[PDB]
């Protein structure tokens, strides 16, 4: 049993995570954009990329956006939907939150969301967060509304990959 840095080393090896330019530093106290997390999900679950397609109307969401193949893939898969359907906004530059990540992983893992869960999560996310908590993907005193740290995401990702046989 294996430190957060060691889990990151393993996930980086398997191409799931990448680090930052000019440094081998994992920066586990830093946040992560929704674009970066979409990639992580794609690699975590071996989803196929989707090129030449753009389903969202965010500014600079187009063929010059390195993240679009990943954002399209997690969207076809049902793991992510964006933040509103009417305006078709994904918010690729915003940071992934623990309750958002929770949604994605609970769904990818086909776990049962909890009806009428009591916790601090946003309404739409309460069953997702509670299920993610009970799966050991996030700690029960993580803040569901806070941006997830890279440490928390390494831990959640590593645990999730375990749950896939």
Ligand X SMILES: CO[C@@H]1O[C@@H]2CO[C@](C)(C(=O)O)O[C@H]2[C@H](O)[C@@H]1NC(C)=O
Q: Which residues of the shown chain bind ligand X in the complex (CB under 6 A)?
A: 17-21, 32, 36, 39-40, 80-85, 100, 103-104, 124
Q: How far apart are CA 128 and CA 110, in angstroms?
A: 11
Query: Is there a contact between 45 and 73 (Cβ–Cβ < 8 Å)?
Result: no
* In the complex, least distance from residue 44 CB atom to ligand X, rounded to whole angstroms: 11
Number of residue whose CB is nearest ligand X:
18
Q: By C-beta, is 110 or 165 nearer to ligand X? A: 110
* In the complex, least distance from residue 60 CB atom to ligand X, rounded to whole angstroms: 16
* In the complex, least distance from residue 38 CB atom to ligand X, rounded to whole angstroms: 9
Q: How far apart are CA 6 and CA 11, in angstroms?
A: 9
> What own/partner pairs with CB < 8 Å and gap ≥ 24 does 118-124 have?
119/144, 120/144, 120/145, 121/145
* In the complex, least distance from residue 107 CB atom to ligand X, rounded to whole angstroms: 9
Q: Tokens standing for 148?
A: 């997830």
Q: By C-beta, is 1 or 68 nearer to ligand X? A: 68
């Amino acid at each position: 049993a294996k430190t957060t840095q060691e889990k990151f080393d393993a996930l980086k090896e398997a191409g799931v995570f990448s680090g930052y330019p000019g440094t081998t530093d994992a920066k586990l106290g830093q946040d992560m954009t929704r674009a970066e997390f979409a990639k992580v999900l794609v690699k975590l679950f071996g989803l196929k990329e989707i090129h030449g397609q753009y389903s969202y109307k965010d500014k600079n969401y187009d063929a010059k956006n390195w993240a679009a193949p990943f954002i399209e893939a997690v969207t076809a898969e049902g793991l992510m939907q964006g933040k509103d359907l009417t305006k078709k906004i994904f918010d690729f530059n915003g940071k992934i939150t623990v309750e958002e990540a929770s949604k994605t992983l609970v769904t990818a893992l086909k776990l049962e969301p909890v009806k009428d869960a009591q916790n601090k999560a946003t309404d739409w996310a309460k069953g997702y967060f509670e299920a993610a908590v009970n799966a050991g993907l996030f700690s029960k005193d993580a803040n569901p509304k806070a941006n997830a740290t890279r440490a928390q995401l390494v831990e959640a990702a590593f645990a999730a990959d375990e749950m896939s046989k």
